[PDB]
């Protein structure tokens, strides 16, 4: 019938039509970006909702995969022996001082990495709080795996504005963050229509690009990047 | 801040070759170049039921039905030829050096501190006591494990190869050099100085060690036993196979290495039993009991961490043990 | 209601088109009431002439195949149908959706009576087998095993064992005979205690909801599955009274005007399929009638199970 | 108990196979379990393998299955330190005792 | 604005073949064309506890129970025969050229700018320092990774196979030409101009490289190690699997290529280690750390982006590092 925009996914049916059995059908294809995903022939009688829920399985699968693909690292605060884990913190970016390390009886507290090659640092509790404050991962940080490095840099010269697809990951509809367009507009402090010029693409009319500060504050409010 | 590295992989020093076994007669050892190799052969065994029963197999009729069906196996045995009372065993040992340098490491600061600790140890007391003890373990045929136990006479020749030719030959008598006493001998001091030069990186040391043991004519020799997947029948169950390379029975190289590592006389329990192998937590598999328990803080890991991080240098015999553990290599670090 | 003096093993019986709709709420394996009624019909037809009684049936169900299909786009299933003959005007008649199933079951029959002392065991076993080879078990014809390799006679085993070890060996051999199957037993105690567990979890919960909870796969959030003790199928557990017991000639268009008729409603209980080596004796698997006709409650169960 | 039940059930459908599949040629076909895998080969061979299952009475095969059941346990040192491994070994020993007793009287 | 291309895949130059291991004797290396190959055999290993215990296995009873259940494994092992001390390694190296041209480039103008940058590099200094350092890594047997740490004498013969025949022969000493110093030698310079003509595009260069190492008679040689699927039983675990091509032990081709790549000395850390492999962000697997961090602004990507986009040409050592990464090749650019 036409493509259904759910999250960054587009359920695009084929223009040609067939009649499997005695019923009409259509080749519906799930696109994540310019890449197709799972494709299933849906009978013409199927409702748009049916189409969406039908592909919902693939949709959910992708979301789960992405979350796992970009799950943030986790540092463990352990005791002097190192076997018992007193605390676990999901880090955004590993500290810049840890090295091949194993807890020593000398120090009461040690920070280590979740992986086998345990690289870490012996820190006290206040330094542990300082490190957890400056390097914590926001709850939806895995979406930063799906975004390129140019749209996530804090340097404006290396910063590239997000496209319609990259913005359309996390603004409205069944997004990965789950928020709506009006909610994302109210987070950025402006009305719904001015954010609707940001969301809608196609021609250059009503295609103002979001600024660097607004994009990073929106990422802060959605808990995707810089939200410690 | 000097934490222990998460990986501290160490390449083993004293790398042994696989010890080939041949057979011949005594006093023909000087012409033992073309001796026929010991060949692993098959022999069939049937056996009575002889393990301890669990108080329900102790019924008379059921045990009678048990003995009426003896169990059948085909065991691989290694026997001398009947015109041969002497077993010859040949291997080569490579002494590398650089014992304190890990092959893989994570923390470069910990690696540099461990390198400085090992270099400090070499500076006051170089590789002399450990090399003398390794020379003693070469001198007695401890690599003939059950294989010099009932031997009338054991002899060991250790040759030094330089450019494909022999440099220094060390003919010994393994009956005199005991398996418990680490005494001093001039030829043993010369072999200790050669292993000292190998372990300190002064030169390359490759030693060809040949042991002749007088067991008996056509008697049983004891090579390394392999692993059986048990994919056959029950009559020819193949319950025991012995290791060989090319139609020639042999001993595993790691068994020879564990024989040379039996120098550890500094475990906190009583040393009247004798030396045990160089290993973390002093674990001999025959006794099933670990000397150098981590409760007593005399194992390798606690002593190494106290030596490197806290700079608590242990007793001199214990740092000998720690550096011998570094010589034997390992996957020290987090596991 | 009584301990059987002997157990007769009717072998692998291939029932062709059995009633797959066991109950108004359940489908699949047929009702145990069909099996108990078949054994009572066997006692009615050939049991009296052999001076024996046939009460109690243990079902093993060596093979089940359902004449069903899964339509595309649905996770449920539909029943394959039979083309009924046309009406007198040449039109297609109204279709009643009736499902069929190919079964292969073996039956343990409880035999008690003086005729066990009057005939050889193989004689009465062969007589009840050749009587059962021309009957029906759940609405399907019984395939009597013609021109295959090795046919299976019965093995009537006397439950009055001379020794406990000989009785144990006989029961284990009889269990080894009926090996590729599952004994279907009644679980009134398990369903009642699960009802009490749900009533402690949440009050005013009926026995229907406890029966439903013991059949659906429950998904619990941290996403794991809530386990079950066994297979825990929903079975028709009998018939409850829906009307007073009318006179034999009172009910219009009854099957016979000599048997009293009472309108009933299906009773639903919890059954369990187990491997038959997990029972103390094979007489525990016998399905017995239990009428209690003053209060309705025309049940079939497995008494003396645990 | 359910798992060893299924093992018997597996052997049960191994009664539905060919009488002499265990006598086919092969380099590796699990001949230690083949005395219990094919009970009907005693009909195929009069004295080549019919007396072997009677004299041997193969009940150790479940111990091999117990080894496979030892791959069904978790690799946790907390269970081994506590008596949970003791209870696991006790119920494992009881259920494979029942399994070995079931496999013992296969000749009747 | 001349941004970087999103797709910047590069083909590798200096493609090495798989390095076949054979076994033989010293002074027979002039006729080593019939030598029997090193065969990946199997041996059984029994082990006790030698790893760090996580404070719960340190109890004496639990440790002794772990000792009484040893971890039995089967390991793939590569050993020379008892009459063979020399390990021969043969591989062919194909020098392609055209290292400036990417295999894939989204941006034309970026492709023209990168080609002009490589052209102005070659006009400034050709493929001469990089080819000299690659020729040094050819001359020393750095491709003999663990078959050189205890080798008594190593020798490398490199032949220029033009029309299926030796156009020019070179013989070297892999121990004299160390793994630390990039010195000057006449034969090394001639091999450097041959690799220079290969890398520029002047001609086709194929080199047959043969290596001989004095390890020892029957000693363990170390091929590349494969990856274990870990599906079988814990008894026959197969913890270690070595690499073979046709019943014949071998080293992986990318391991040889990484060892030839080990020429990067211009990383901002000190010269205590020596040359490392030319990787983006200068990674070393054994040290577990990255020289040339992006934070210290000496990684390949920052240097290339300064050199190409904004014409900030780095020092000639960093230019050598960038062109050596282009010779190495990779999937550069944003995915």
UniProtKB/Swiss-Prot annotation, chain D:
GO terms for biological process: defense response to virus. Disruption phenotype: Mutants lose phage DMS3 infection-dependent inhibition of biofilm formation while there is normal biofilm formation in the absence of phage infection. Decreased production of crRNA in the presence or absence of phage. Disruption of the entire Y.pestis-subtype CRISPR region disrupts crRNA production but does not alter phage resistance (possibly OLNs PA14_33350 to PA14_33310, and the flanking CRISPR loci), indicating this CRISPR is not involved in phage resistance. Disulfide bonds: none annotated. The keyword Protein biosynthesis does not apply. Keywords: Antiviral defense. The keyword Kinase does not apply. Transmembrane segments: none annotated. CRISPR (clustered regularly interspaced short palindromic repeat) is an adaptive immune system that provides protection against mobile genetic elements (viruses, transposable elements and conjugative plasmids). CRISPR clusters contain sequences complementary to antecedent mobile elements and target invading nucleic acids. CRISPR clusters are transcribed and processed into CRISPR RNA (crRNA). Cas3 and Cascade participate in CRISPR interference, the third stage of CRISPR immunity (Potential). Involved in crRNA production or stability. Belongs to the CRISPR-associated Csy1 family. Interacts directly with Csy2; part of the Csy ribonucleoprotein complex with a probable stoichiometry of Csy1(1),Csy2(1),Csy3(6),Cas6/Csy4(1)-crRNA(1). A Csy3(6),Cas6/Csy4(1)-crRNA(1) subcomplex is also formed. In this bacteria, Y.pestis-subtype CRISPRs do not confer resistance to phage DMS3 or MP22, but instead are required for DMS3 infection-dependent inhibition of biofilm formation and possibly motility. This is CRISPR-associated protein Csy1. It comes from Pseudomonas aeruginosa (strain UCBPP-PA14). The chain holds residues 327 to 434 of 434 of the full protein.
């Amino acid at each position: 019938m036409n493509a259904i925009h759910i999250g960054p996914f587009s359920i695009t049916p084929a223009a040609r039509g067939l009649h499997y059995g005695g019923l009409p059908h259509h080749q519906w294809t799930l696109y994540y970006g310019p890449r197709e995903m799972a494709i299933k022939t849906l009978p013409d009688s199927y409702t748009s909702s049916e189409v969406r829920d039908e592909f919902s399985d693939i949709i959910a699968e992708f979301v789960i995969d992405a979350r796992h693909r970009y799950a943030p690292d986790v540092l463990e605060l352990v005791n002097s022996d190192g076997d018992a884990v007193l605390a676990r913190v999901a880090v955004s970016r590993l500290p810049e001082a840890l090295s091949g390390c194993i807890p020593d009886d000398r120090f009461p507290y040690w920070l280590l990495t979740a992986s086998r090659p345990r690289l870490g640092l012996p820190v006290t509790l206040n330094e542990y709080t300082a490190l957890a404050v400056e390097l914590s991962a926001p709850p939806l940080a895995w979406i930063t795996g799906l975004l390129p490095g140019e749209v996530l840099t804090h340097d404006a010269e290396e910063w590239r504005p997000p496209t319609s697809w990259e913005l359309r990951h996390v603004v409205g509809e069944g997004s990965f963050t789950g928020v709506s367009g009006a909610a994302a507009a109210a987070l950025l402090g402006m009305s719904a229509t001015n954010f609707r010029k940001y969301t809608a693409g196609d021609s250059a009319a009503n295609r103002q690009k979001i600024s660097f500060a607004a994009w990073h504050y929106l990422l802060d409010r959605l808990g995707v990047k810089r939200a410690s | 801040i000097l934490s222990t590295a998460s990986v501290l992989a160490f390449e083993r020093k004293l790398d042994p070759s696989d010890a080939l076994m041949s057979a011949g007669a005594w006093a023909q050892r000087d012409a033992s170049q073309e001796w026929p190799a010991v060949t692993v052969r098959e022999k069939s065994v049937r056996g009575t039921i002889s393990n301890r029963l669990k108080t329900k197999d102790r019924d008379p009729a059921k045990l009678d039905a048990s003995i009426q069906s003896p169990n059948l196996q085909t065991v691989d045995v290694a026997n001398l030829p009947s015109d041969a009372d002497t077993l010859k065993v040949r291997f080569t040992l490579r002494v590398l050096g650089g014992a304190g340098t890990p092959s893989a490491c994570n923390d470069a600061a910990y690696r540099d501190k461990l390198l400085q600790t090992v270099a400090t140890y070499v500076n006051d007391q170089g590789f002399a006591e450990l090399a003398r003890r390794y020379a003693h373990n070469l001198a007695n045929a401890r690599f003939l494990w059950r294989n010099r136990v009932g031997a009338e006479a054991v002899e060991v020749r250790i040759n030094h190869i330089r450019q494909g030719e022999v440099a220094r030959a060390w003919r010994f008598d393994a009956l005199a050099i005991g398996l418990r006493d680490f005494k001093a001998d001039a030829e043993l001091d010369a072999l200790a100085e050669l292993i000292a030069s190998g372990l300190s990186g002064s030169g390359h040391v490759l030693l060809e060690v040949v042991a002749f043991a007088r067991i008996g004519d056509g008697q049983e020799v004891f090579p390394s036993q392999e692993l059986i997947l048990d994919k056959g029948d029950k009559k020819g169950q193949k319950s025991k196979t012995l290791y060989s390379v090319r139609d020639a029975a042999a001993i595993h190289s790691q068994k020879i290495g564990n024989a040379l590592r039996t120098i550890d006389t500094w475990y906190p329990d009583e040393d009247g039993l004798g030396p045990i192998a160089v290993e973390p937590y002093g674990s001999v598999t025959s006794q099933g009991k670990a000397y150098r328990q981590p409760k007593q803080k005399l194992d390798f890991y606690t002593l190494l961490d106290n030596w490197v991080l806290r700079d608590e240098a242990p007793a001199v015999e214990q740092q000998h043990y720690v550096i011998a553990n570094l010589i034997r290599g390992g996957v020290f670090g987090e596991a | 209601v009584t301990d059987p003096e002997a157990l007769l093993l009717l072998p692998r019986l291939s029932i062709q088109n059995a009633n797959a709709i066991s109950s108004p709420l359940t489908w699949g394996f047929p009702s145990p009431g069909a099996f108990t009624g078949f054994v009572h019909a066997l006692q009615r037809r050939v049991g009296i002439s052999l001076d024996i009684e046939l009460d109690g049936v243990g079902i093993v169900c060596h093979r089940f195949e359902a004449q069903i299909s899964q339509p595309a786009g649905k996770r449920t299933k539909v029943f394959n149908l039979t083309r009924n003959p046309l009406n007198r005007d040449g039109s297609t008649a109204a279709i009643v959706e009736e499902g069929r199933a190919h079964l292969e079951v073996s039956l343990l029959l409880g035999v008690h009576g003086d005729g066990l002392d009057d005939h050889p065991a193989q004689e009465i076993a062969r007589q009840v087998q050749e009587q059962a080879g021309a009957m029906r078990l759940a609405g399907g014809s019984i395939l009597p095993w013609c021109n295959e390799r090795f046919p299976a006679p019965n093995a009537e085993l006397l439950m009055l064992g001379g020794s406990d070890e000989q009785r144990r060996k006989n029961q284990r051999r009889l269990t080894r005979r009926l090996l590729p199957g599952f004994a279907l037993v009644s679980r009134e105690a398990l369903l009642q205690q699960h009802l009490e567990t749900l009533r402690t979890t949440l009050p005013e919960a009926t026995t229907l909801d406890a029966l439903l909870d013991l059949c659906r796969i429950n998904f619990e959030p941290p996403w794991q599955v809530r386990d079950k003790p066994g297979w825990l199928v929903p079975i028709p557990a009998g018939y409850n009274a829906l009307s007073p017991l009318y006179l034999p000639g009172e009910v219009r268009n009854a099957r016979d005007r000599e048997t009293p008729l009472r309108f009933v409603e299906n009773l639903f209980g919890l059954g369990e399929w187990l491997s038959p080596h997990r029972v103390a004796a094979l007489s525990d698997l016998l399905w017995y009638h239990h009428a209690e006709p003053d209060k309705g409650l025309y049940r079939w169960s497995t008494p003396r199970f645990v | 108990a359910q798992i060893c039940d299924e093992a018997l059930q597996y052997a049960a459908r191994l009664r539905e196979l060919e009488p002499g599949w265990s006598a086919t040629p092969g380099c590796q076909l699990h001949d230690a379990e083949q005395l219990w895998l094919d009970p009907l080969r005693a009909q195929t061979d009069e004295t080549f393998l019919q007396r072997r299952l009677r004299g041997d009475w193969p009940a150790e095969v479940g111990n091999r299955f117990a080894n496979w059941l030892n791959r069904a346990v978790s690799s946790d040192s907390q269970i081994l330190g506590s008596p949970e491994a003791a209870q696991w070994s006790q119920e494992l020993s009881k259920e494979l005792t029942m399994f070995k007793e079931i496999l013992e009287d296969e000749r009747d």
